[PDB]
Each structure stands twice: as C-alpha cells, then as structure tokens.
C-alpha cells in the first residue's frame, strides 16, 4: 500500500487533494471469505455505509444483494443494473413518496416496527413483503440504535395481528444489535428472540420464512487472516433456525466497506510549541473524519516517506482543516517529526467516511484512485 | 412567518423534500442595526456560516466586506462580483495552493499564529498582508476555538519579531472568543490584550492599524429589538484601548447575520405512539440541517403550521431525524399538539451553521429554498 501510494504521488506530482486508494479486489475477497464464514446466510450490503459506484458494482457482479435506506439508495443500485428484485428497503420508516417510488420501481421487501408503517403500507404499498424489526441491543457497539427503532417485546404480537388485519404479508423478523459490534452473545440472544417473534407471527397466520440478522460485524484481520463471531452467530443459526425452509439474510456495511480504501491526506500546516508539535491536514472531521467524533475512533496515519528505524518519535497533535475546534482527527500521537508537504495515509478508511462528507468552510473535496 | 410557510406550500402543492424559507430583508434590517450598534467596526460576513448565494449578494450590495476561510470561499464572493480589497483570508492556516490562488485573486490580507505559516508567505504570497491572530477565550462560548488557534502570550514578540525578519507586513492583531458567546467580559479581556499585542508590533517596528474583534455575537431579539448588552461593553472596550481615528476596527461575524435569516420547514414522515409517548420521524436530521443539535447542544422547538385549539392537549412528543443513526434525534422530549404523518412544522431562526453543514447520508439531506 505504501509503494502504491507512493506512485500514484509520482504519477500525480500536482495531486492537491486528499485522496482515497479504493481497491475492488479486496472486497472480492472478503465476499468470498463471507460465503465460508456464513454458508447460510446472504449478504445485503448496507449501501449507505459507502455507496461508491465502483464498490457497488464490484458486489452485485459477486451475487451481493443490497440494503436500502432511502429511494435515493434505491435508485444508486438499480443505475448499477442490480435487479430491484435484490433489494430489501430496510428501513423502518419510509416517506409515503419513496413507498410509491420503491412499489413502481419492483422493491417490494421492507422492514417496519410501528403500526402507523402499517397503514402506509396498506395504504401505498399494500403487497410490500414485510419483515418486523424488533429491538436486540449490544450494550457494547460502537454505535446505539435500540431506542430509535426495533419493536419492543410486548408488543410484537400486536403489530403481527395488526398486518394480519390489514392482510399484510409478514415474511420475517430482522434485528440489529448496534452499529460496530464486538460481542457475539448479543447476536445469541437476538437470534433466539427472533425466534420467538417468528412463532409469534405463525401463532397470528403469517407465513414467515426470513431471519434477517442485520448488520454491525467487523471483518477484523490479524496476521492476514479473518477472524471466526461468526462461528457464534452459526451456531444461534443451527440451535433456533436449523430447517432449510429458512432464508437467513444480513445486511452488513463495515465488514465490506472498512478495508475498501485508504485515505491519503497532507501535512498543509505546522506549529510547533514547547515540544509539542501541532499539524494541520487538508482533511478533518467535517470531511473523511466524522468517525473521530461518532465512533470515538482514534486514527494512526502511516507516514509515505521512509525513516531509519531509530528516528526519535514526538508527541503529536493532528489537526483538520477547519475553523472549528471539534475538529482535532488526533489529539496525542507519537511519530516522526512532519513536515508541510508530507503525504500520509490512514488505513481500513472506507467505512462512515467518504459518505459523510461535508463542504464546510468550502473543504470537503477529494479524489478517488481505483487499484 | 405562519403564513408566509403555509403560503408556499398552497402556491407548491407537490412540495415534498424539507425547505428553507429566507428572507434578504431581514439581514438587511440587521445590518443597519449592526451600523448603529457598531458604528466604528466594518464587519467582514463569515462564509462559512451560511454560503447561500442570494445572502452573499445582500451583504455585496449593503457594503458589508467578507472573511473566507478557504479557496472554495474566496471563489464564491468574487463570482457575486465582489472586489478582492473587501476579502481577508481569515484563517491562520492555509493550504501552500490556496494561497497561491488567494494571491492570483487579490486576496492580500490574512490571519496566522506560526512561525511555518510565515515561511509560506515569505515564500507564496510575500505581499500579502499579515493579521496575527492572538487566543483570547470565552469559556462560556457554545463552540470552542483556543486550543486550536491563536498565539499564547508567550509566544506575541517571538511571532512579531519572526515576521519583520521575513520582511511581512503585520498590520494587525485578531482574536475569537469562541462561536456563540454571550460574555461582554471575554470581549473587553480580548481586546484588551489585543492593544497589548499592538503595542508590541510597534515596539518590533511594524506599523500595524487594524483590529479585528473576531465573531461569535448572536443577534439576541426581545420585543423586536435587539439587545446591546454585548455591543456597549465591546464598544466601552474600543473607548479604552482603541480610540484612535487611525486604527481601522473589523469583526468577522457570521451567526450575528445569518442566525434569522432562514426558517427550515420540515414534515411527519413517520410516527410511533407507545405508552403515552408520541414518536415522529421527520424528513430531516442531524445530518442534513439540524447539525447545531450535535455541536451546539441545540434544543429546537417546532412551529405547527396547521392551525390547533387553544386548549388543545399538548403530548410528549420526540422528534427523530430520518437516518437510521440512533444519535439522530432533532429534540429528545418536548410538548407539542399530537402531529399527523403529513403535517408541516417549521424551526425559526435556522440559519447560522444550518444548510452549510448537509452531508448526502443515507441518501437524505436534499433541501428547497424560497425566497421571501
Ligand atoms: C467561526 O467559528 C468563526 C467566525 C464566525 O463565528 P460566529 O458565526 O460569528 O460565531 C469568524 N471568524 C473565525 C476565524 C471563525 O473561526
Ligand atoms: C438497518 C441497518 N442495517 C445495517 C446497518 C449496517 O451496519 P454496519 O455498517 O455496522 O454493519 C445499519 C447501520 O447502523 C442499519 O441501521
């Protein structure tokens, strides 16, 4: 990555922008790596984790389906010439307008956890196939989702008998524990509550056949090689699903998104006071660095010029670009002494990134660089 | 303002994505007032905090100068025709190619607090006229700003001296307290220290003319006027260290103007009611115009555009943005009229780091403006 780096620098010596290095080939592999680690479960990839055009096309040419949030989503993979058929519109709340637009369009699989969804759908969409979102929380992701959405336990048979009454078609039961997930007892737990509401639901005289265990798995890598959460989730998989008349589906965003790119950003600034030394990139928070305040991340740049290996460390602070003194993408780092001028890349940047891009203080702008 | 909301969306029946409604008049208005409440201080309008081009031509042609932070900034006020002598480059650390550009554009006044930032002065842009910015804090401010900016004291001579030796002309001193003050104190301490910094570029054997009192100041409204509790003491402030005709005093104020500039009409997407409580899901979030929620602690009340009972039974109510992120909650608790899926509110006063700030997340954060 780094001689890589390095000549795209070379081949680009008025390159000015920060720039993402996006490599397909990765995500490949990690497609495959998903088809071993989960034989039975089928991906849809959470689009707005990154909605690359090239990421996005490398998967649906590997057999990935997709998850959608919004008729914009919708519209991003139907360009990509993804079968809205692969489609699931997993978000519990949907304008009436993206309703009418997904039904037109052949998006016909949704998610749901109010009975005011429910009358949208008979209202707007009324053969939408619907999967009932309950709430499972990991109380150790990265990122909480469980008071916003998800249905509570005492009232899952309510919303079942309500689409009933309205002859809604409910197909399944989805959860997720939260957003950068770590604790495989969680996804345990809600496979068994899942379960339970999918009994619930052939109790009322649905006809259920989906688990959908949504999204929040890292695909965490030591020494080259993927760890094995999901020997947990395969194993809540066989003890509460074991009957091939199941589909099992997820809808993960990070585990294919967060190794997809580097991103590569210079030294534009230095300030260098009692021994501490304060840099300034043409990145920030408000760019490619929203992560730094949402998940709390606390990034170490890899340096593309070469040092000896007994170069004295400095206690570092990294700035962003803009005004605002939120903006810090590390606040205490050791490294090398930089300089205005040095390139450097942050690794496994491809997830919560480049989507959450702003054009704040008139920053925001990078390249992208394929393979 | 009811009215007006209600009126757009009678006369845009087919009205869907969320809308601002904004009003040149008002920041007009406001600026005749900032010439009362500030009748020695030029204000250069923050850019940053609202580009809206509609508002950028109203302050091109009210006289009001422009302080941009960016290359992408300075593109935009000379596109309005502006001319490059109302412009500093007010942030003190800017990208080599930046000021490159800032030097073909006649962009020749700039803030720093470095030493490098000096060298790449001397080296790009050796005309350009240096502002040295000085921390000066409120530590009651909504958004603070110094630890990442600003000379410390220690440091005021060293700088000084550092620039008269590269042959840069320092022709003033700056500060910001901090975005969204409310401490007439923190201003007075400011510029007090800031004369003291003045005093020690004379002494370096610069001839510096220039204060620049820096943002930060809301256009508070009570009863429809505004309140002078923080333009008196800055001006008693002026009357002690400045009062000399020959210094030139600016601000850099960006809230100040566009804080009421705008409305933000959203609706009821989608809603949840379990044990009394009365969830909506709105067609915004925190990621497309309610940022401020996140980074300025924000609370925000809705106005009900449809037309309710006097008596009628306030509900607690929870608004959440449209993103399926659990942090995106536009108001955690607050009493409202029950709301309907299809209902239109709107959030007064949303202007200042509002637009500015949308990111495309989840494939939302589209927006409308009208005029007027
Ligand atoms: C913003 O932090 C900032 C402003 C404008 O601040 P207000 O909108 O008036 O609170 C002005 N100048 C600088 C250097 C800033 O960073
Ligand atoms: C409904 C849903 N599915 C999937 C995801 C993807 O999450 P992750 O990128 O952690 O796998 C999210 C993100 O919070 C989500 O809200």
Known sequence: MNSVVNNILKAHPHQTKSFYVSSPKIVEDLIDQWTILFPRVTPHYAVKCNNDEVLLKTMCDKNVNFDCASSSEIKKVIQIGVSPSRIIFAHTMKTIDDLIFAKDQGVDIATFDSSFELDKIHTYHPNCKMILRIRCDDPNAAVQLGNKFGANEDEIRHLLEYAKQLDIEVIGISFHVGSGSR????????????????????????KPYILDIGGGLHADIDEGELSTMSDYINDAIKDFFPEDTVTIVAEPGRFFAEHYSVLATQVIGKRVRDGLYEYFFNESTYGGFSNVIFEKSVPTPQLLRDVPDDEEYVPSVLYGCTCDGVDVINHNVALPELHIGDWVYFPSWGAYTNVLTTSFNGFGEYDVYYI
């Not at 495989?184 to 009322?204: D, G, H, L, T, W």
């Open 183 to 206: 604790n495989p007892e969680a996804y345990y737990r809600a496979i068994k509550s899942s379960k339970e509401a999918f009994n619930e639901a052939i109790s009322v005289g649905h």
